[PDB]
């Protein structure tokens, strides 16, 4: 009949779908889909956590569909080619499927439809993994924000979204379309050892939507009473963990909101209702990035700014290396990679450390790093992920003024007691949190344990001295 493909990609959920549920205003007769991507699955900068996680929101999203009463079909191969063809193959009345914000999905999505128009079907795109889409928040003039204090002003003035209705009572395809669709699609959902990864670290929070949920509810019904100052230590489990849940959509934008804002309403106590306000503000904080990543593109070539293009980075391979591998010598950015290459997901605070330490410290092209974290975590997001980077060299959005973090600093401030530390480095866990904080370890208090690859405070000279000659050059 009139059937309509809703297309799956960072949206793997059935609830709170901005898409889905325009697509089932429109036809009972849903079918969802999901296309396995070559060019995503195959590369380099794929992190096995990310597909593991992956994989198991679609077990469960495959669950939902026929509960709901019709399925998610399975594709493997180039989309702009399988979608049209699979649509025409269905005579589809329309595909839909919610907006992205990176070159790649975008110019894949421009793609899409085009041969979707081509072939006279219907695409329908729709903002959907942001509370405000890049084209709602503007500035007095029309144009983009680079600097997070005027767009967090406007942003927070916007009427907020609220969650839309989970599709029901959905209509399964017939043998007969079954048949004209067969040579397109996948049997089954291939497992984690058959697409040729495999990972046993755990995730944040488990894969799937319904895990998501719960521990949204969780997290706002007390948890995030306390966000300021918990959120700051990464010794203490003061954050949600919901971080590969909004990367892959197990959970909606709208729901996050709504359960934080249900929760600032419920709440009488002051302080309470400050830390769920930070909270909040961590969402705005992530759509400022993605809205650069959407206005700005060539964020993700690199550097930024001018000066930073220039800049005279050394790159001494083994330093990078014993970076990856947790072997430089300061406790808190080893206790912070093992963490990384161990359970694919790093504290926040720990993540500001480790990479003002390659970029200040050792003085590598911060792309090996934003490169060798998107290998690596779950929740792997190159709008976050790039943000983050530029943000170790202010080589990008809302710069600040030239900045060197100090490791012993910033471990005695943010792991006073070392418990973050002894946690990741159990080897370590004889030495006093003194030693563990400022990095200074006796070689037979030491053990196996490597000294610092670097004396920060020589590094921190050569640093600036670079800086200021490249910024006199100019
Ligand atoms: C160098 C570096 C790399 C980073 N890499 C990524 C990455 O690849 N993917 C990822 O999603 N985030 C990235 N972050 C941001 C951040 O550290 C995480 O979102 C966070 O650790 C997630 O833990 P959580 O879910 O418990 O966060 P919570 O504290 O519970 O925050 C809730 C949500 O807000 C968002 N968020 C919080 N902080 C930020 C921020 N700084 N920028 C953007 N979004 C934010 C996330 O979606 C997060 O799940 C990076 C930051 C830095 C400094």
Same mark, same amino acid.
């Given at each position: 009949?009139?059937?309509?493909?809703?297309?799956?990609?960072?949206?793997?959920?059935?609830?709170?779908?901005?898409?889905?549920?325009?697509?089932?205003?429109?036809?009972?007769?849903?079918?969802?889909?999901?296309?396995?991507?070559?060019?995503?699955?195959?590369?380099?900068?794929?992190?096995?956590?990310?597909?593991?996680?992956?994989?198991?929101?679609?077990?469960?999203?495959?669950?939902?569909?026929?509960?709901?009463?019709?399925?998610?079909?399975?594709?493997?191969?180039?989309?702009?080619?399988?979608?049209?063809?699979?649509?025409?193959?269905?005579?589809? &009345?329309?595909?839909?499927?919610?907006?992205?914000?990176?070159?790649?999905?975008?110019?894949?999505?421009?793609?899409?439809?085009?041969?979707?128009?081509?072939?006279?079907?219907?695409?329908?795109?729709?903002?959907?993994?942001?509370?405000?889409?890049?084209?709602?928040?503007?500035?007095?003039?029309?144009?983009?924000?680079?600097?997070?204090?005027?767009?967090?002003?406007?942003?927070?003035?916007?009427?907020?979204?609220?969650?839309?209705?989970?599709?029901?009572?959905?209509?399964?395809?017939?043998?007969?379309?079954?048949?004209?669709?067969?040579?397109?699609?996948?049997?089954?959902?291939?497992?984690?050892?058959?697409?040729?990864?495999?990972?046993?670290?755990?995730?944040?929070?488990?894969?799937?939507?319904?895990?998501?949920?719960?521990?949204?509810?969780?997290?706002?019904?007390?948890?995030?009473?306390?966000?300021?100052?918990?959120?700051?230590?990464?010794?203490?489990?003061?954050?949600?963990?919901?971080?590969?849940?909004?990367?892959?959509?197990?959970?909606?934008?709208?729901?996050?909101?709504?359960?934080?804002?249900?929760?600032?309403?419920?709440?009488?106590?002051?302080?309470?209702?400050?830390?769920?306000?930070?909270?909040?503000?961590?969402?705005?904080?992530?759509?400022?990035?993605?809205?650069?990543?959407?206005?700005?593109?060539?964020?993700?070539?690199?550097?930024?700014?001018?000066?930073?293009?220039?800049?005279?980075?050394?790159?001494?391979?083994?330093?990078?290396?014993?970076?990856?591998?947790?072997?430089?010598?300061?406790?808190?950015?080893?206790?912070?990679?093992?963490?990384?290459?161990?359970?694919?997901?790093?504290?926040?605070?720990?993540?500001?450390?480790?990479?003002?330490?390659?970029?200040?410290?050792?003085?590598?092209?911060?792309?090996?790093? &934003?490169?060798?974290?998107?290998?690596?975590?779950?929740?792997?997001?190159?709008?976050?992920?790039?943000?983050?980077?530029?943000?170790?060299?202010?080589?990008?959005?809302?710069?600040?003024?030239?900045?060197?973090?100090?490791?012993?600093?910033?471990?005695?401030?943010?792991?006073?007691?070392?418990?973050?530390?002894?946690?990741?480095?159990?080897?370590?866990?004889?030495?006093?949190?003194?030693?563990?904080?400022?990095? &200074?370890?006796?070689?037979?208090?030491?053990?196996?344990?490597?000294?610092?690859?670097?004396?920060?405070?020589?590094?921190?000279?050569?640093?600036?001295?670079?800086?200021?000659?490249?910024?006199?050059?100019?």
């Amino acid at each position: 009949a009139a059937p309509i493909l809703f297309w799956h990609r960072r949206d793997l959920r059935l609830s709170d779908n901005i898409g889905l549920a325009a697509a089932r205003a429109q036809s009972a007769q849903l079918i969802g889909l999901f296309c396995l991507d070559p060019q995503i699955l195959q590369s380099a900068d794929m992190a096995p956590a990310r597909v593991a996680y992956l994989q198991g929101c679609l077990q469960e999203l495959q669950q939902r569909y026929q509960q709901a009463g019709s399925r998610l079909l399975l594709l493997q191969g180039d989309p702009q080619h399988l979608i049209p063809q699979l649509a025409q193959q269905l005579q589809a &009345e329309a595909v839909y499927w919610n907006q992205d914000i990176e070159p790649y999905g975008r110019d894949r999505d421009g793609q899409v439809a085009a041969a979707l128009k081509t072939a006279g079907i219907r695409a329908v795109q729709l903002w959907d993994q942001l509370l405000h889409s890049p084209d709602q928040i503007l500035s007095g003039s029309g144009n983009p924000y680079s600097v997070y204090g005027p767009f967090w002003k406007n942003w927070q003035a916007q009427p907020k979204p609220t969650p839309v209705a989970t599709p029901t009572e959905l209509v399964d395809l017939s043998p007969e379309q079954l048949t004209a669709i067969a040579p397109l699609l996948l049997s089954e959902l291939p497992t984690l050892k058959q697409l040729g990864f495999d990972w046993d670290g755990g995730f944040p929070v488990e894969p799937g939507e319904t895990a998501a949920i719960a521990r949204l509810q969780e997290f706002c019904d007390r948890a995030i009473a306390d966000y300021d100052p918990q959120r700051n230590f990464p010794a203490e489990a003061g954050t949600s963990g919901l971080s590969p849940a909004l990367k892959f959509g197990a959970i909606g934008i709208r729901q996050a909101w709504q359960a934080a804002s249900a929760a600032h309403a419920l709440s009488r106590s002051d302080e309470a209702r400050n830390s769920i306000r930070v909270w909040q503000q961590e969402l705005a904080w992530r759509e400022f990035y993605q809205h650069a990543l959407y206005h700005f593109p060539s964020l993700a070539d690199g550097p930024y700014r001018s000066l930073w293009q220039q800049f005279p980075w050394e790159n001494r391979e083994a330093l990078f290396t014993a970076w990856t591998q947790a072997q430089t010598g300061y406790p808190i950015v080893d206790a912070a990679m093992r963490q990384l290459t161990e359970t694919g997901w790093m504290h926040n605070r720990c993540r500001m450390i480790v990479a003002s330490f390659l970029t200040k410290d050792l003085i590598i092209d911060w792309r090996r790093g &934003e490169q060798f974290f998107m290998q690596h975590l779950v929740d792997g997001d190159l709008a976050a992920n790039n943000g983050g980077w530029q943000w170790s060299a202010s080589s990008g959005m809302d710069p600040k003024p030239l900045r060197i973090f100090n490791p012993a600093s910033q471990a005695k401030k943010f792991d006073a007691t070392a418990t973050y530390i002894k946690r990741w480095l159990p080897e370590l866990r004889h030495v006093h949190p003194k030693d563990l904080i400022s990095g &200074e370890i006796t070689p037979i208090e030491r053990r196996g344990y490597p000294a610092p690859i670097v004396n920060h405070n020589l590094r921190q000279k050569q640093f600036k001295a670079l800086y200021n000659q490249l910024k006199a050059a100019i």
